[PDB]
PDB file of C-alpha atoms and ligand atoms in Angstrom:
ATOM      1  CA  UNK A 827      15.806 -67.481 -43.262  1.00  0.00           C
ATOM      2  CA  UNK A 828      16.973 -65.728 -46.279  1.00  0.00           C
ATOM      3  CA  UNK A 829      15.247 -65.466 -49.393  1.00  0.00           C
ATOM      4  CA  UNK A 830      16.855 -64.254 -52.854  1.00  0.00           C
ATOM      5  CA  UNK A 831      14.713 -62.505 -55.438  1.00  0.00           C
ATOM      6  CA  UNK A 832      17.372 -61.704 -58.747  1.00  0.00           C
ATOM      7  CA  UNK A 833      17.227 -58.243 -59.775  1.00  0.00           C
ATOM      8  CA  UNK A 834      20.604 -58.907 -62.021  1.00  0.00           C
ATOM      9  CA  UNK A 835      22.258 -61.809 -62.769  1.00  0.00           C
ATOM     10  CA  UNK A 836      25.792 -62.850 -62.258  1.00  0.00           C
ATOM     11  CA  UNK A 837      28.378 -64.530 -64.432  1.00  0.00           C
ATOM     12  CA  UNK A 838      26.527 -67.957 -62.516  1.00  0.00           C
ATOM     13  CA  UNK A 839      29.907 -69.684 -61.858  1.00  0.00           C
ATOM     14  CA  UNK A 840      32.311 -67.038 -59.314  1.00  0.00           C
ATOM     15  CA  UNK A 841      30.817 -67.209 -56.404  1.00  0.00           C
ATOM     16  CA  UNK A 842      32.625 -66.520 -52.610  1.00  0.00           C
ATOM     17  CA  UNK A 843      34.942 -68.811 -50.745  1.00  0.00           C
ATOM     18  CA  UNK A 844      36.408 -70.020 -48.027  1.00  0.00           C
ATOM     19  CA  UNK A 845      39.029 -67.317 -46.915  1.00  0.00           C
ATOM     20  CA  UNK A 846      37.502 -64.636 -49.900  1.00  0.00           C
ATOM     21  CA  UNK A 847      36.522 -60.829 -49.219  1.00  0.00           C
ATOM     22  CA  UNK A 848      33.419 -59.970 -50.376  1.00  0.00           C
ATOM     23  CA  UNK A 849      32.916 -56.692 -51.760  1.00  0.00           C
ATOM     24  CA  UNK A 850      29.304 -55.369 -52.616  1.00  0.00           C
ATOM     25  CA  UNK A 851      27.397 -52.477 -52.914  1.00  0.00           C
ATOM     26  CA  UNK A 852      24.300 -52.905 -50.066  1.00  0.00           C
ATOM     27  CA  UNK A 853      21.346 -50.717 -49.646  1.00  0.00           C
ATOM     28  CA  UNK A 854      19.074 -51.955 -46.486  1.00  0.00           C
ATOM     29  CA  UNK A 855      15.561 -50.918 -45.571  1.00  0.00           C
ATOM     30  CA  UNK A 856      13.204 -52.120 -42.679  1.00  0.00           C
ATOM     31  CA  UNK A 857      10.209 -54.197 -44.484  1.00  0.00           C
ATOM     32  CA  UNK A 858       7.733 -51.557 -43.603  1.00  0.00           C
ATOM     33  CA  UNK A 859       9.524 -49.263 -46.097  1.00  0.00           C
ATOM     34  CA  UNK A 860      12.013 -46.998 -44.436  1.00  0.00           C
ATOM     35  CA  UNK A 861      15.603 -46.893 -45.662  1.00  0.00           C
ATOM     36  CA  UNK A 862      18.382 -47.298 -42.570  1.00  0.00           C
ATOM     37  CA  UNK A 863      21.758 -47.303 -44.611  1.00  0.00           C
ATOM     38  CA  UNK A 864      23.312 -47.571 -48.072  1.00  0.00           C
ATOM     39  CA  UNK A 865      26.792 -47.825 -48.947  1.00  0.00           C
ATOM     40  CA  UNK A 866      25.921 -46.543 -52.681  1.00  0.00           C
ATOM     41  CA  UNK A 867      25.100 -42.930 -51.243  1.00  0.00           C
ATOM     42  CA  UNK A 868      28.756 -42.973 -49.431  1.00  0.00           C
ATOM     43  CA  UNK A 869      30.441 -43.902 -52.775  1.00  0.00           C
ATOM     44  CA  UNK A 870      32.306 -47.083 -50.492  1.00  0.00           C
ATOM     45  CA  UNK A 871      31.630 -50.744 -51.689  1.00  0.00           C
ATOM     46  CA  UNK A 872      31.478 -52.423 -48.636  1.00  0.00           C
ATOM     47  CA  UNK A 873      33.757 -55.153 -47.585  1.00  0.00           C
ATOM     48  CA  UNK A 874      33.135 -58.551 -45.393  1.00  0.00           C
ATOM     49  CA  UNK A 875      35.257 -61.991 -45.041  1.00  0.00           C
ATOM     50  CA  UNK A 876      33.418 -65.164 -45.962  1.00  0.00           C
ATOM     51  CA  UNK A 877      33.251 -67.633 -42.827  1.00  0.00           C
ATOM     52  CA  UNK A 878      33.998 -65.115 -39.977  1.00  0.00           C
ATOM     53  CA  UNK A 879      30.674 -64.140 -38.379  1.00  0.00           C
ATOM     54  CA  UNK A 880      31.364 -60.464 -39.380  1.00  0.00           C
ATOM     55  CA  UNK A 881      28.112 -59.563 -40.394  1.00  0.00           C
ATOM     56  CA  UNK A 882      24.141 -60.917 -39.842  1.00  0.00           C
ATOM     57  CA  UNK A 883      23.439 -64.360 -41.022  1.00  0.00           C
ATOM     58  CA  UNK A 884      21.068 -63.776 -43.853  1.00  0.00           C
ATOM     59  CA  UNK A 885      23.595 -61.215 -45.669  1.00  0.00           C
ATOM     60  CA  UNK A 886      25.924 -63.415 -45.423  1.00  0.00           C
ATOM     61  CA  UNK A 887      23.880 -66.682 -46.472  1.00  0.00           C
ATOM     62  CA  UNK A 888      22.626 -64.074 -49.471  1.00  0.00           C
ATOM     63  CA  UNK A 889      25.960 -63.195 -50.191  1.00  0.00           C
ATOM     64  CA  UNK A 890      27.321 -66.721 -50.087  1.00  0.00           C
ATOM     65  CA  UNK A 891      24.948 -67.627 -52.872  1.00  0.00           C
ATOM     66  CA  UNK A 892      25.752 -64.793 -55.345  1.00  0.00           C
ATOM     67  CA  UNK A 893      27.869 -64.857 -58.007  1.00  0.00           C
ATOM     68  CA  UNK A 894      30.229 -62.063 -59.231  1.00  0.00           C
ATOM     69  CA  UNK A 895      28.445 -59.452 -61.228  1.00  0.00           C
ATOM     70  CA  UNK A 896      25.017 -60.414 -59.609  1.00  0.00           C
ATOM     71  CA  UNK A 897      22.253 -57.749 -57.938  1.00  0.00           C
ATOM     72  CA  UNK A 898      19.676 -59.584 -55.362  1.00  0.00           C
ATOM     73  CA  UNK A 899      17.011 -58.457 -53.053  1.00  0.00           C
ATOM     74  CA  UNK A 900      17.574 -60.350 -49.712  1.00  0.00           C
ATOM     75  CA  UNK A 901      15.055 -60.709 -47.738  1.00  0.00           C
ATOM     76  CA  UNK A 902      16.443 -61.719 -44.182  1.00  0.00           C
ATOM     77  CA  UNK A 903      13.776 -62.736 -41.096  1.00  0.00           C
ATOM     78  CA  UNK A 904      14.633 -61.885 -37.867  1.00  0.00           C
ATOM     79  CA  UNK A 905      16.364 -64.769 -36.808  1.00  0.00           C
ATOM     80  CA  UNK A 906      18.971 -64.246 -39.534  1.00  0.00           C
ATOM     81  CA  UNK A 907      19.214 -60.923 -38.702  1.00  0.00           C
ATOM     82  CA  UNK A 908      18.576 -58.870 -35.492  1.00  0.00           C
ATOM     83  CA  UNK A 909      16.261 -60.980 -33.696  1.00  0.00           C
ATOM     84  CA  UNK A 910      14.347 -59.823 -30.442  1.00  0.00           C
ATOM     85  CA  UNK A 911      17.010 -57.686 -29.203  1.00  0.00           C
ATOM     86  CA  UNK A 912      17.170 -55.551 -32.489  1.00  0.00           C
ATOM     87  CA  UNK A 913      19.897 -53.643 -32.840  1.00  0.00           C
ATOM     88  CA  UNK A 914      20.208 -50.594 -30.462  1.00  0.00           C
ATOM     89  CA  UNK A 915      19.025 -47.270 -31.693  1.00  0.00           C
ATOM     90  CA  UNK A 916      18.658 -48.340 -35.002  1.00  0.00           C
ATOM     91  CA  UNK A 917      16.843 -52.067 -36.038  1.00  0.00           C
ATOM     92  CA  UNK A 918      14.203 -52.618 -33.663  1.00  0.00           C
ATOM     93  CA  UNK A 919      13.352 -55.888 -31.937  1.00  0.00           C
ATOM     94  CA  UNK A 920      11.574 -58.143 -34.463  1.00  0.00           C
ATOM     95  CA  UNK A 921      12.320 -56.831 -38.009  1.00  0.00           C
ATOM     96  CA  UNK A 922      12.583 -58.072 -40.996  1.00  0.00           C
ATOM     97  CA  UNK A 923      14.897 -56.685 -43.491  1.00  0.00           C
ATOM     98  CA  UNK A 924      15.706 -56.067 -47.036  1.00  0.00           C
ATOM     99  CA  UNK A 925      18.763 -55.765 -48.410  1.00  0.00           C
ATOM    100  CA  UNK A 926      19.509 -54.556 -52.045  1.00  0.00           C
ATOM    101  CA  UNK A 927      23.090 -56.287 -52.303  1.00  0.00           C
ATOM    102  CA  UNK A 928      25.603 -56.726 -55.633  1.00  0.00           C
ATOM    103  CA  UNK A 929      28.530 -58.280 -55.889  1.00  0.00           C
ATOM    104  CA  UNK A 930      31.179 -56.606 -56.997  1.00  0.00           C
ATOM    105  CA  UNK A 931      34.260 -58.617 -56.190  1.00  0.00           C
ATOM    106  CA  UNK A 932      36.465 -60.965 -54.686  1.00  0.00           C
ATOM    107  CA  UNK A 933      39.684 -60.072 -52.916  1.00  0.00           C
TER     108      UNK A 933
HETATM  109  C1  LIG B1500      28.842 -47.225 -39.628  1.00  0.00           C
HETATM  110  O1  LIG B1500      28.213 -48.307 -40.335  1.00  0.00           O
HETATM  111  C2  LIG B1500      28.558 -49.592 -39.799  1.00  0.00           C
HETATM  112  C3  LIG B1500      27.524 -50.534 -40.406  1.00  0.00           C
HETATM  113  C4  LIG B1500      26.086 -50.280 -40.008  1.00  0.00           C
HETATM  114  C5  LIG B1500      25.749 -50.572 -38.562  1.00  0.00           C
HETATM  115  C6  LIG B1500      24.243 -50.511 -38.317  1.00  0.00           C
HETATM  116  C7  LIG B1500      23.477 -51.414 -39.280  1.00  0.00           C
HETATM  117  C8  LIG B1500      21.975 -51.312 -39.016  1.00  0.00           C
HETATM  118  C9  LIG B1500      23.930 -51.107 -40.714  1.00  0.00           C
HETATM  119  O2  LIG B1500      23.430 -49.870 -41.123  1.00  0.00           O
HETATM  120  O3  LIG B1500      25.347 -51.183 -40.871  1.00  0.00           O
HETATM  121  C10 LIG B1500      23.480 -52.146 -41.764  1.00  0.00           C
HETATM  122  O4  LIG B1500      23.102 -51.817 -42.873  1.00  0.00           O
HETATM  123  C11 LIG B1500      23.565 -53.599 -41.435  1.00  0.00           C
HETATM  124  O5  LIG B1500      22.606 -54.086 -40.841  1.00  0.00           O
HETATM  125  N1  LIG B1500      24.647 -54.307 -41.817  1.00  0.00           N
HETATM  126  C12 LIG B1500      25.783 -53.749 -42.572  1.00  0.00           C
HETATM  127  C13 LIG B1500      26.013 -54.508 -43.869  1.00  0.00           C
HETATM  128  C14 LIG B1500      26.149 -56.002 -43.609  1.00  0.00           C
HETATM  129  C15 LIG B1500      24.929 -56.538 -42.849  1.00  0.00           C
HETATM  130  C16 LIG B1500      24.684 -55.751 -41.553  1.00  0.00           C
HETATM  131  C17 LIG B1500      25.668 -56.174 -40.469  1.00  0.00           C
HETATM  132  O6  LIG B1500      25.868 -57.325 -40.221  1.00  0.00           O
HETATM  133  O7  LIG B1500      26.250 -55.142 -39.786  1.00  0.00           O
HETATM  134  C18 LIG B1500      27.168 -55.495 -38.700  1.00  0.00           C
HETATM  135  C19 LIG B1500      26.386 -55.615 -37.395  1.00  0.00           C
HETATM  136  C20 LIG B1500      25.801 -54.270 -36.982  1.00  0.00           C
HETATM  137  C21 LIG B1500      27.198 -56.239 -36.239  1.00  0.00           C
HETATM  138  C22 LIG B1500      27.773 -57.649 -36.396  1.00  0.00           C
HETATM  139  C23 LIG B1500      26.713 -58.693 -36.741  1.00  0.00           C
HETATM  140  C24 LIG B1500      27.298 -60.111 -36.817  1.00  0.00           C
HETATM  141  C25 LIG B1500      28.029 -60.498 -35.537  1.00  0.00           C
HETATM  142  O8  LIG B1500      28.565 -61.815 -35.681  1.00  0.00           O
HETATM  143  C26 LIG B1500      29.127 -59.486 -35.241  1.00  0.00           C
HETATM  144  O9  LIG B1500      29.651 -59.911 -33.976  1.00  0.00           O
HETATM  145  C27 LIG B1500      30.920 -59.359 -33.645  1.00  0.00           C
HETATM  146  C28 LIG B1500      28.526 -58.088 -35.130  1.00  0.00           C
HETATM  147  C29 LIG B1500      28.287 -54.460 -38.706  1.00  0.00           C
HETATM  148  C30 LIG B1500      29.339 -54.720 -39.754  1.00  0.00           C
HETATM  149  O10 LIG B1500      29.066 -55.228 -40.826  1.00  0.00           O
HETATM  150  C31 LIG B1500      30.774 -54.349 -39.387  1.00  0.00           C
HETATM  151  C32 LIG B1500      31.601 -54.057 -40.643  1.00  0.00           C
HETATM  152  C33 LIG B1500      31.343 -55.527 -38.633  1.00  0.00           C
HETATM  153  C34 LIG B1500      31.609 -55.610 -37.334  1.00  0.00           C
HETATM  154  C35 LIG B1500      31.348 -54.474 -36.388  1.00  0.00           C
HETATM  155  C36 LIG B1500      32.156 -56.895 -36.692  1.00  0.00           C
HETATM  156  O11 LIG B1500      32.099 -58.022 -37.550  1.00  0.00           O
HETATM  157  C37 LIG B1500      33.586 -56.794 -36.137  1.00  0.00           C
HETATM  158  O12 LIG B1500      33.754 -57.944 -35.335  1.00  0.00           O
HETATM  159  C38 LIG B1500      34.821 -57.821 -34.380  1.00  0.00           C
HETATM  160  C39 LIG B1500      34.610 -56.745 -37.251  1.00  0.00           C
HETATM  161  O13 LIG B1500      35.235 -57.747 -37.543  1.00  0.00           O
HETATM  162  C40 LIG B1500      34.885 -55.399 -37.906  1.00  0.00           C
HETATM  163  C41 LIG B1500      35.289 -55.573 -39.374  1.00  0.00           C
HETATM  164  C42 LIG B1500      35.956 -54.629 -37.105  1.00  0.00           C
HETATM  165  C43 LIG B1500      36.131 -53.156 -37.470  1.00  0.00           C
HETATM  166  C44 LIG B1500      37.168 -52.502 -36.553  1.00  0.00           C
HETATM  167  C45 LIG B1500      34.783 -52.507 -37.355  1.00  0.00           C
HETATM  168  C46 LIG B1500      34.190 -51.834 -38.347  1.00  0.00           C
HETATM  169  C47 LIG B1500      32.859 -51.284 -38.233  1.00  0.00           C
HETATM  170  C48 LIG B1500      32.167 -50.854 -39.279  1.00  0.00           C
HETATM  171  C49 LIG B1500      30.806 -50.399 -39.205  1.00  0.00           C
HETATM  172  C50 LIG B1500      29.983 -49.977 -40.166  1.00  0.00           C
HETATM  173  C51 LIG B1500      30.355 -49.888 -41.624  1.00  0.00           C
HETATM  174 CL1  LIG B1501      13.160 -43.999 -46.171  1.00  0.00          CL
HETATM  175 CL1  LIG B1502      31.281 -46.307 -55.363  1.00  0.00          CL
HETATM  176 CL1  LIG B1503      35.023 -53.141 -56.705  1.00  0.00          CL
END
């Protein structure tokens, strides 16, 4: 599954809802150390809807259990991630990933 380590915490009562875009600031790196994306180096928080399968399972578990303001390292299994197909030319079959994730807001 996911797991959620706090690296800053939020205001611990605005968290996402039902119909709510998420907006965070992601940075994502294979568990073996190397770094595949970050939205901070592109200077564009990173949007998502709550509820509508846009993104992996575990970010969205992680996210769903933030509050506004908050920082977490997410660490996401396959099976709430890529799983054995991986994701083509990119996340191989297998991996486990981190995700440095804070939430910034909710539209
Ligand atoms: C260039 O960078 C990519 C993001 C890259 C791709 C490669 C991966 C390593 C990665 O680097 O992100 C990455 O860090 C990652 O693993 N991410 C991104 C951050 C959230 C977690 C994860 C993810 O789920 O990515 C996602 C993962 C790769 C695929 C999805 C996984 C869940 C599954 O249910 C979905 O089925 C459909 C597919 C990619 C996204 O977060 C983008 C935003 C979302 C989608 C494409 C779909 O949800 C799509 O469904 C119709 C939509 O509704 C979108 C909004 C429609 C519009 C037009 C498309 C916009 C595309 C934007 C693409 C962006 C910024
Ligand atoms: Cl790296
Ligand atoms: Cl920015
Ligand atoms: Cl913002």
């Amino acid at each position: 599954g996911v797991e959620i380590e706090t690296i800053s915490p939020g205001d611990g009562r605005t968290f996402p809802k039902k119909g709510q875009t998420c907006v965070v600031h992601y940075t994502g790196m294979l568990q073996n150390g190397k770094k595949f994306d970050s939205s901070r180096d592109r200077n564009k928080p990173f949007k998502f809807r709550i509820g509508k399968q846009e993104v992996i399972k575990g970010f969205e578990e992680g996210a769903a259990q933030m509050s506004l303001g908050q920082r977490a390292k997410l660490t996401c299994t396959p099976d709430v991630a890529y799983g054995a197909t991986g994701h083509p030319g990119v996340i191989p079959p297998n991996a486990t990933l981190i995700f440095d994730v804070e939430l910034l807001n909710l539209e």
